[PDB]
């Protein structure tokens, strides 16, 4: 029964570390999302194939 209480509380605790790393991952997602914004400001203008049909004809 000590084990039953242990598994109750430790199930709780592993679910809790679950939610904690879940918040870590959610904030990785959101902060890295605003960081996608930050670095996109810098890198999007070149995601393009340019100066191909300029001369070939």
């Amino acid at each position: 029964r000590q084990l039953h209480a242990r598994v109750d509380k430790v199930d709780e605790e592993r679910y809790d570390i679950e939610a904690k790393v879940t918040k870590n991952i959610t904030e990785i997602a959101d902060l890295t999302q605003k960081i996608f914004d930050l670095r996109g400001k810098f890198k999007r203008p070149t995601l393009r194939r340019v100066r191909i049909s300029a001369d070939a004809m």
Binding site: R49, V50, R51, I52
Partner: protein, 160 residues
């Protein structure tokens, strides 16, 4: 020649064989290096690129560092591994992420030259200020005097 390590290690052999397949136009066959640096533009294009001719002449001067006018395998394969990083890609950013936050065991938001030199001397490698400085401003392309996370990734990227 040491940069050839980044030229061939991160790349593969059959990548060089496909280079040969795309290159066999100027060398029509049974020849040993008749290639010139003018049509370097052509030979890079047939590799599937969207480049500018200023970078053609740049690579032409980014090669001929020996003054030859013809291109060597190490620095060419490297300028690819420097631009066309069609390598074994060198790393993962979970591996590199743990690398950062272990170097930056402090998670400063940046591996300063502090943890940089820490691990460079933990290497056993004799590491001077120029060593940490080259490594930093290769990471810290921002030249803020400290390698940040992605600075450290790009820094340790394409590395053995």
């Amino acid at each position: 020649d040491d940069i050839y390590k980044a030229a061939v290690e991160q790349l593969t052999e059959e990548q060089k064989n496909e280079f040969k397949a795309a290159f066999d136009i100027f060398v029509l066959g049974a020849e040993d290096g008749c290639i010139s640096t003018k049509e370097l533009g052509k030979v890079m294009r047939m590799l599937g690129q969207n480049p500018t001719p200023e970078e053609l002449q740049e690579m032409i001067d980014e090669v001929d560092e020996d003054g030859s006018g013809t291109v060597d395998f190490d620095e060419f394969l490297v300028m690819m591994v420097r631009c066309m990083k069609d390598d074994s890609k060198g790393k993962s950013e979970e591996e590199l992420s743990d690398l950062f936050r272990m170097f930056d065991k402090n998670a400063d938001g940046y591996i300063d030259l502090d943890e940089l030199k820490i691990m460079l001397q933990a290497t056993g490698e004799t590491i001077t200020e120029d060593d940490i400085e080259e490594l930093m401003k290769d990471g810290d392309k921002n030249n803020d005097g400290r390698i940040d996370y992605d600075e450290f990734l790009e820094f340790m990227k394409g590395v053995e």
